[PDB]
Paper text:
Many NLR proteins nucleate the “inflammasome”—a large macromolecular complex that triggers inflammatory cell death and cytokine secretion in response to microbial or danger-associated ligands. Like many other supramolecular assemblies in the human innate immune system, the inflammasome complex relies on homotypic and heterotypic interactions between the death domains (DDs) to initiate, amplify, and propagate pyroptotic signaling. Inflammasome sensor NLRs can be grouped into two categories based on their DDs: PYRIN domain (PYD) and caspase activation and recruitment domain (CARD), both domains were found to form filamentous complexes to initiate the inflammasome formation. Extending this analysis, we also found that specific type II interface motifs directly dictate the compatibility of heterotypic pairwise CARD-CARD interactions among NLRP1, CARD8, NLRC4, ASC, and CASP1.
To test this, we solved the structures of recombinant NLRP1-CARD and CARD8-CARD filaments using cryo-EM, both at 3.7 Å with Gold standard FSC = 0.143, without masking. NLRP1-CARD filaments are relatively flexible and adopt multiple helical organizations in vitro, as evidenced by heterogeneous 2D and 3D classes observed during structural analysis using RELION 3.0. Trimming of the last eight a.a. (1466–1473) helped stabilize the homogenous form of NLRP1-CARD single filament. This conformation was subsequently verified to be a signaling-competent confirmation based on functional experiments using 293T-ASC-GFP cells (see below). Importantly, the resolved CARD filament density fits snugly into the lower resolution model of NLRP1-FIINDUPA-CARD filament based on negative stain EM, matching the shape and dimensions of the inner layer almost perfectly. NLRP1-CARD filaments demonstrate a balanced charge distribution on its axial surface, similar to previously published DD complexes. In the NLRP1-CARD complex, two positively charged histidine residues (His1454 and His1452) extend from the Type IIb surface and interact with negatively charged residues, Asp1437 and Ser1435 on the Type IIa surface. In other words, NLRP1-CARD uses the HPH motif on its Type IIb surface to preferentially engage ASC-CARD and disfavor CASP1-CARD. Thus, NLRP1 requires endogenous ASC for inflammasome activation in human cells, whereas CARD8 can directly activate caspase-1 independently of ASC.
Residue numbers in the entry:
A (entry chain K), B (entry chain A), C (entry chain L), D (entry chain D), E (entry chain C), F (entry chain B), ...: 1379 to 1462
The structure:
Amino acid sequence: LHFVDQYREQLIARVTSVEVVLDKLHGQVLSQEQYERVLAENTRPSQMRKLFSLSQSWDRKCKDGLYQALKETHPHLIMELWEK
Amino acid sequence: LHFVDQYREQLIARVTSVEVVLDKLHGQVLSQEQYERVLAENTRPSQMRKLFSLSQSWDRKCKDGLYQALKETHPHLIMELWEK
Amino acid sequence: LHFVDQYREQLIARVTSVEVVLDKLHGQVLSQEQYERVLAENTRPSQMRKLFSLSQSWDRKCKDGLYQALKETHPHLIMELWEK
Amino acid sequence: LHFVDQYREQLIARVTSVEVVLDKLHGQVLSQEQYERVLAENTRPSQMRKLFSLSQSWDRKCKDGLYQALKETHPHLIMELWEK
Amino acid sequence: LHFVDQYREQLIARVTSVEVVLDKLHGQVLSQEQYERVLAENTRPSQMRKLFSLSQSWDRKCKDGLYQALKETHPHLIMELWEK
Amino acid sequence: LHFVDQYREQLIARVTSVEVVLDKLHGQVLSQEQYERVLAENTRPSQMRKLFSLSQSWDRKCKDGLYQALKETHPHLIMELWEK
Amino acid sequence: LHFVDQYREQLIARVTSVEVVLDKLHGQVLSQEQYERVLAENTRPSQMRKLFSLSQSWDRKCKDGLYQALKETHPHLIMELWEK
Amino acid sequence: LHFVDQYREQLIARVTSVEVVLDKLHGQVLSQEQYERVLAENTRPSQMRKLFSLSQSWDRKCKDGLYQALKETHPHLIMELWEK
Amino acid sequence: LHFVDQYREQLIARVTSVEVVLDKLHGQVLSQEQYERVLAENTRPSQMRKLFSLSQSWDRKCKDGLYQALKETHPHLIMELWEK
Amino acid sequence: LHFVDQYREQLIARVTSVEVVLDKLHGQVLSQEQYERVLAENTRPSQMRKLFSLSQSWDRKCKDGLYQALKETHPHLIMELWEK
Amino acid sequence: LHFVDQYREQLIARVTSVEVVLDKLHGQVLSQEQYERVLAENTRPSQMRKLFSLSQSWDRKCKDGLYQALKETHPHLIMELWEK
Amino acid sequence: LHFVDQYREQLIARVTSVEVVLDKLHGQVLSQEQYERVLAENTRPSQMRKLFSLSQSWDRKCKDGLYQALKETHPHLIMELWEK
């Protein structure tokens, strides 16, 4: 069981800079359509929720990419959950 | 007879934050499918209704978990029903 | 029947300083999520409407708090309705 | 046969300010549930349609209330149909 | 002969809030199965019909309960028929 | 003379939940074939009739089981007949 | 006597996710026709009923498969019956 | 036995972009009606299910087309099943 | 010879709203049993046929009631046959 | 034989705005019940089908009215079929 | 011996779009009654079965029409059987 | 076969200025209702899709008008597809 799959209920309520963490994954994991659909929600918590709805088709390449981007953007949050 | 099973007709007309009380139960009690099916109703009273249709396969672990989450989200609602 | 519950059709069309009456209620009655969700409407009449959708889970503590904040912000409006 | 019951096919294609004419009827004719259900349609013509589905249980008090509110909101439309 | 048993042909064409009048009877008169079977019809007039098919096993407790809930939900319909 | 053997003309005109009272008796009193044959009638009064056609080979075990299941499903009907 | 053959009256009133437990058995035990026929019932308790009507041609391979799928989908229900 | 016909139980729980894989097949294999009927389900897992109900009249052209489109949309999923 | 008794082969091929013309006759002419039996046919032409099988025990009250209800529901068909 | 009765197989595959062509016919030809039943189909081609099942009791007023409404909504379709 | 009369057991297990192949035959070969009766089955394989029960009164016009419509809707199935 | 009807899968993923190509077609081909319904989608790819659902009732006048407006708005895209 991966790191993101266990604390999923914790992250969806605290990540703020949705746009800059959405940017880095554009070229590899997801196509154009999935990038566009996220703009429909128009609230910080809801958007992230929709993203985790696509966790059904992630394998280790894609989950590991997500953990990579989330460690590069915030060195205080990922640290804070990993300590527990 | 448990607390939730007797006053069931009272809660389905008053619970507001459907999403945040659905969030906490994801990882343990129910699978992904039951989590997705609830989005179909698209009205605050109806959604909760569908959830109580699954009370057929709950035992004390699950009823006690739900009572726990409802005590954590509203410290005024559960209080108000427990007084009566 | 409380004061706010009777003239509800009167208030939603005249309250101007939505932000400063939303501020005082933050710490006690409602959580973070309901505070954020109100930003979706983006019009003075619509926003207040959404707030009154949550009156289903208010008891005397919360209704009385709202009456309190509305008396502190506008000493001309609440008086004007109370005279009639 | 009342005024609203005869020209029903005419009104459902022209009424614009659905929200403010729905507001005035809240306290007397319909309960909370019917007030909430109308938000499901999300199109100006469809919503009013659903409202007329409740004409089955209106009597003269309620039809007269509806004609009253529709005369108070638009002094050009109700006049325009009554002339014919 | 009870009130519900004589004007049965009048009610099946006018009751709108099927769901909220079905809710109140859940705990005492009927079991879970009859509560679920009503969802099969999926039209306002048809559903109520099926309910009256169970009038064969009602005695005064159950007829009186139904009359009670229908007086509590609509104070205009029961009034309007009782006057005649 | 047993309870069911005397009011045989009374029950066949009032029992509604045929399926759930047929269910409980499956494992002990009757075999699979008689369970299947009852589906041929396709009417609430007729089906029950067919069941009583097997009263020729019941002894106290089976009649007592039937009275048991019918008291468990309807606590209002069996009471209502036993009072008289 | 197998596990499913004794507590059959217990399962038909509690299994909720009919579709996802019907899925796993598709490839080996039953053909396409029996898979399609189950859609006719359109109620959670009834559908499951029809499945057990095919228990006439099951041997240990098929009963063991069904017990397998029901243990994989719900680790709380099969446990709760196995304890008694 | 083809690739899609063996791992059918694997795909129906993981395919995300239903719309864009439905789009490419329009012009050749299926008519307009089958394209329209898929909108009824309104849930990610259910929709795809209905599509596989038409596998009765596919031959190598049509199955091969489906494998082609599913390889073009997700270069990570089809890989992941083909490795095993 | 009455009106309905002469054109018996004409009506059984054209009456559509069987249910709403069956409703009006419930309270006086026919009992509950005959009302329930009609649901067995499940086709518009066949149902009416069964009703005319009971013309053996009709007198003028009941035939006149039937002609009354069919004139009240359809003002175009009864006219069209009466002209000829 | 009327225009609508001959080309019936052509229209049922092309009429799009079911709602606005259903609106105009409400007041004269059909009652409320038939107006409500049409919402059950929930697909553009199927709905029209059900409507044509009622052509059994139409005379020249009703068929001619339908041809009128269909000429008022689409001045391009009725023209296109009438040319042939 | 015609084509349809030889592969009768082959077609009844593979034809999917029952409705659109039933549509084209309406105007010439069969009347309204047989067109309505097919709706009773409510399963894809069974419906077609009933159709072939009318093969007792087909001559070359009607068999040739059915083969025509079945070649027009599916250009892959008729091909696949004709090759063998 | 027209130009738009063959490369329809190409256009639905690239057209940007929905509003200005919807404007020019207002007065002739489609009525007010179809113009209003398109606002429901609220995503650039989805909207155009809905428009192509009305291709069932276009003839050469309307398809030719659509091709005209799309050639007038973008002199780079229509050229780009016509070259292939």
